[PDB]
Amino acid sequence: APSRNGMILKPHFHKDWQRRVATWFNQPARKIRRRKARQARARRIAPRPASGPLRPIVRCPTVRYHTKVRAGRGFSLEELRVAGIHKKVARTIGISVDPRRRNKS
């Protein structure tokens, strides 16, 4: 029942949400586990970079941003061909390669 100018709201608590409540008491343990796994991988690849393969320069769609530059999925085949790098050898050397990227500009 409304009472003297309250906001009209519709809580989405009509299902059995208490059975599907997801707690986060394992967040610090999960962070510790991820940190340990990352350190283990870094020790596994002793001279290789911890982050991993190189990522290309990529711009953003959705003109909302239109200016930000981020890391790409992988280097394009035309880029590899211009640089004189074989696509299969790039994977073994540590260059991220994806075969779906286009090159308009």
Binding site: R20, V21, A22, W24
Partner: protein, 203 residues
């Protein structure tokens, strides 16, 4: 090659030759049992495209599945509840009849493993499919690296979990905007993720 000619011949089903062949095959299959092992594939090109290989350990079963929809499993009336669910007659099953045939073949052949299946004929009341089955414990399959993935226990009863080609379609999963569901593991996974209340430590 002969395989492309056979493929075009099977694509031209409305022709007189293919009509006669389909009618004769349908009559012969209807004169047989509902589940009998074919020794050789009716459609070699379709079997090859689906993954059948002419080597020891590969089995093919022809399954006849009764046509029609699925009426509600209830007594004469007695569909107690709101009139939304009173519908009994004009009801359709979720999975396809090809998936049903694959399920029946896999259930009958517990030792074998279902790979795929194809359509070979259809009557007014019966549909005919051939299901390819592989023996997971045959040496010709186990020693071959390409076809040994079925030997792992993960792929037990693919048709029951809907991992075959026929059962995959019924799940309604894919990429893009056209589905927007099963965007997690499956429809149930997406429902669970979207209807789980994420209560953080610090809120």
């Amino acid at each position: 090659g002969a395989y492309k000619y056979i493929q075009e011949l099977w694509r031209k089903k409305q022709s007189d030759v293919m009509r006669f062949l389909l009618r004769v095959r349908c009559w012969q299959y209807r004169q047989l049992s509902a589940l009998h092992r074919a020794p050789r594939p009716t459609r070699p090109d379709k079997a090859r495209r689906l993954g059948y290989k002419a080597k020891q350990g590969y089995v093919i079963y022809r399954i006849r599945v009764r046509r029609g929809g699925r009426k509600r499993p209830v007594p004469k009336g007695a569909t107690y509840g709101k009139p939304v669910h009173h519908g009994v007659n004009q009801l359709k099953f979720a999975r396809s009849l090809q998936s049903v045939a694959e399920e029946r073949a896999g259930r009958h052949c517990g030792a074998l493993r279902v790979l795929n299946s194809y359509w070979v004929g259809e009557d007014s009341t019966y549909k005919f499919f051939e299901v390819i089955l592989i023996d997971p414990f045959h040496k010709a399959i186990r020693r071959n690296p390409d076809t040994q993935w079925i030997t792992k226990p993960v792929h037990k009863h693919r048709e029951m979990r809907g991992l075959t080609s026929a059962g995959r379609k019924s799940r309604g999963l894919g990429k893009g905007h056209k589905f927007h569901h099963t965007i997690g593991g499956s429809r149930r996974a997406a429902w669970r993720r979207r209807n789980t209340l994420q209560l953080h430590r610090y809120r």
